[PDB]
Ligand binder design. Structure first.
Ligand SMILES: *[C@@H]1O[C@H](CO)[C@@H](O[C@@H]2O[C@H](CO)[C@@H](O)[C@H](O)[C@H]2NC(C)=O)[C@H](O)[C@H]1NC(C)=O
Ligand SMILES: *[C@@H]1O[C@H](CO)[C@@H](O[C@@H]2O[C@H](CO)[C@@H](O)[C@H](O)[C@H]2NC(C)=O)[C@H](O)[C@H]1NC(C)=O
Lengths: 51, 122, 49, 51
């Protein structure tokens, strides 16, 4: 519970810091029919690590 | 009577067709235990699709080994398969594509064969 | 060739229940020893080792 | 857990996933699959309890 609140807090800060960034494609809708990776996401990791 | 149950799968644009049949013709070879093979292909391969199909194939084939092959250039599929090895403890290997690509040193419990050159070897 | 060694090492059928949903077979355990034969696989005078 | 991801955790388009140890624990590293599953799509995963 102590970590939950904090982790989510960090996630929120990371996201709000993230969307300051631009031109991001939505993740693939559903597993079915998509053999391709998602360009958006590595970046989310990069901001989130630098929160 | 006394034959092992085996399955092989091909995915992506490439088609095995007659070559697989030739291998079976080629495959009888010399041996006391005979391979029993069930072949299925999938136009599309997915983490949910791939995971689903092989187990579904488990229900009828009840195969003691699996070979996976792909037309794909995606690295992640092999890792999913490692997870599957961990999940079902049935040998799986792959001859081409993603299954072939280099992967994280196999967890000892997991059983798995892929045609990928080792970093050290390279 | 792995199967060839099933014939030689223990005279035992490798065949096992394949279902993930179903509880894993206890005798699936034995396959672990089976892995070495698996590891030592060759054909056409060529190593798959 | 993984199937819960392809349809349950990806039909909905999560931007990230959190993972924690279950109340009843069997063996070790229970949260191995998710890191792989999200990883295919590069969806960031954050563990709470996995030391
Ligand atoms: C476990 O974590 C919970 C939640 O963080 C703690 O409950 C909080 O305790 C603080 C004490 O300063 C209170 O101010 C909060 O009102 C409580 N709930 C919250 C923070 O929402 C709990 O104390 C922790 N367990 C122990 C034994 O410390
Ligand atoms: C792979 O298996 C082959 C054949 O079983 C092994 O070759 C035999 O090695 C033993 C050593 O104890 C010799 O006594 C035999 O003469 C070899 N061939 C036979 C049985 O004719 C080979 O050693 C194995 N490779 C390993 C375990 O690394």
């Amino acid at each position: 519970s102590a970590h939950i609140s904090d982790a989510v807090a960090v996630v929120a800060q990371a996201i709000h810091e993230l969307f300051e960034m631009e031109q991001i494609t939505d993740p693939p809708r559903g597993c079915v029919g998509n053999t391709n990776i998602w360009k958006t996401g590595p970046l989310f990791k990069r901001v989130l690590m630098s929160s | 009577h006394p034959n092992m149950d085996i399955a092989v799968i091909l995915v992506g644009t490439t088609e095995e067709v007659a070559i697989k049949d030739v291998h079976e013709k080629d495959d009888f070879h010399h041996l006391p235990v005979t391979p029993r093979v069930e072949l299925v292909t999938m136009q599309e391969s997915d983490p949910k699709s791939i995971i689903t199909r092989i187990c579904d194939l488990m229900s009828d084939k009840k195969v003691q080994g699996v070979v996976f092959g792909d037309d794909t250039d995606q690295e992640a599929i092999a890792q999913i398969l490692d997870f599957i090895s961990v999940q079902t403890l049935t040998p799986i290997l792959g001859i081409h594509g993603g299954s072939s690509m280099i992967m994280a040193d196999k967890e000892e419990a997991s059983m798995f064969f892929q045609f990928g050159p080792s970093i050290e070897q390279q | 060739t792995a199967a060839s060694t099933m014939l030689s090492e223990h005279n035992s059928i490798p065949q096992s229940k394949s279902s993930c949903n179903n509880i894993q077979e206890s005798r699936v355990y034995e396959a672990h020893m089976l892995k070495r034969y698996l590891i030592n696989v060759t054909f056409e005078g060529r190593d798959l080792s | 857990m993984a199937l819960s991801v392809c349809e349950d955790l990806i039909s909905s388009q999560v931007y990230a996933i959190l993972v924690s140890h279950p109340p009843a624990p069997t063996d070790h590293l229970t949260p191995t699959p998710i890191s792989y599953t999200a990883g295919f799509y590069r969806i960031p995963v954050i563990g709470l309890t996995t030391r």
